[PDB]
């Protein structure tokens, strides 16, 4: 069923984050893993899979550790040919050339589209729709992560969603609607002067998927 919408004072306030917002920003500013039709080559711990994926652009990784919520998810995708799409990290990437991410995995077979599919993001500032823009995927089932990355990546460029020290926006959540059912993620870091990249991205480790045909995306921001 539907996840309920944010209650009063449920959302992280960016004014209560006193650290460097840079460390959030760099997760959505040109920082992503992407690969087509690959199969795991190894495994470190029981809830992860390792893929041979080369950073052709910047050469920052040859292997990617994809971390799941549980063993079942890893077992499921172990020997499957998959597509990978997600926001990765290096700082405190535990992997005994390398990088870490969570989820972002979909079966390749039976999930490709003849042509790219568009999903319109409706962006609200203090309730008002001032901006709309499409994200595209080639997948019938696509991870919320992939969509989330694409949305925030856009918004980091244009609207400066995140900056080195702090955001123009006090609160922000991204909402995914499929028919009646919906869910959302808080786009702002927990309060304090310590931002843990790995901890934040761990929300993607459920590998949550949506139908790219039915899903609508709404971004609700508030100003200062």
């Amino acid at each position, epitope marked *: 069923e539907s996840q309920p919408d944010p209650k009063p004072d449920e959302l992280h306030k960016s004014s209560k984050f006193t650290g*460097l917002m840079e460390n959030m920003k760099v997760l959505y500013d040109d920082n992503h893993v992407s690969a087509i039709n690959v199969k795991s080559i190894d495994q470190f711990l029981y809830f992860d899979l390792i893929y041979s994926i080369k950073d052709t652009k910047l050469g920052n990784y040859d292997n990617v550790r994809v971390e799941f919520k549980n063993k079942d998810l890893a077992d499921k995708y172990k020997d499957k040919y998959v597509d990978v799409f997600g926001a990765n990290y290096y700082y405190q990437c535990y992997f005994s050339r390398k990088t870490c991410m969570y989820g972002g995995v979909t079966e390749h077979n039976g999930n490709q589209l003849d042509k790219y599919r568009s999903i319109t993001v409706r962006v609200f500032e203090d309730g008002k729709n001032l901006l709309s823009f499409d994200v595209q995927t080639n997948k019938k089932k696509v991870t919320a992560q992939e969509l989330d990355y694409l949305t925030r990546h856009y918004l980091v460029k244009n609207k400066k969603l995140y900056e080195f020290n702090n955001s123009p926006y006090e609160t922000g959540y991204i909402k995914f609607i499929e028919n009646e059912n919906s869910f959302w993620y808080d786009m702002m870091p927990a309060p304090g002067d310590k931002f843990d*990249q790995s901890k934040y991205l761990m929300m993607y480790n459920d590998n949550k998927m949506v139908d790219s045909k039915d899903v609508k995306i709404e971004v609700y921001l508030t100003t200062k």
Partner: nanobody, 128 residues
Framework: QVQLVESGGGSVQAGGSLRLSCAASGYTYSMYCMGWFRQAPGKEREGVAGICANGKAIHYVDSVKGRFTISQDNAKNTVYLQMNSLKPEDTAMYYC?????????????????????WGQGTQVTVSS
């Protein structure tokens, strides 16, 4: 392929000054981090100064605070190290390093881990 070529190393005397320079080339994209490391014979390689995110994040090792200044010209794609009040302790091979990975890695920001690209270095000498 990335290339870092350091220069400006020399043989000075206690209380002297040197300005290191590094010419970066071969990528055509924007580098996130650029830094200066040093290593003497015997001792492990140590990070000295760093400058990240269009100069928004500058860090120094304690032993060079107030004496060394890292700086950047984006127009030239050069990084500099103004080395004032030099001491025998500062004698070493100085290396420029670079990195395209983002973030300010608390306490690991001047470690060798933070950087993937490296020059061949320039010798610095300081005589009592």
């Amino acid at each position: 392929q990335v290339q870092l070529v350091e220069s400006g190393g020399g043989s000075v005397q206690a209380g002297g000054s040197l300005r290191l320079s590094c010419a970066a080339s071969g990528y055509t994209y924007s580098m996130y981090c650029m830094g200066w490391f040093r290593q003497a014979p015997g001792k492990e390689r140590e990070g000295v100064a760093g400058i990240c995110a269009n100069g928004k994040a500058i860090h120094y090792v304690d032993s060079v605070k107030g004496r060394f200044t890292i700086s950047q010209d984006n127009a030239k794609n050069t990084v500099y190290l103004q080395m004032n009040s030099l001491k025998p302790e500062d004698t070493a091979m100085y290396y420029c390093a670079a990195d395209s990975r983002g973030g300010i890695w608390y306490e690991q920001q001047l470690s060798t881990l933070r950087y993937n690209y490296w020059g061949q270095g320039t010798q610095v000498t300081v005589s009592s």
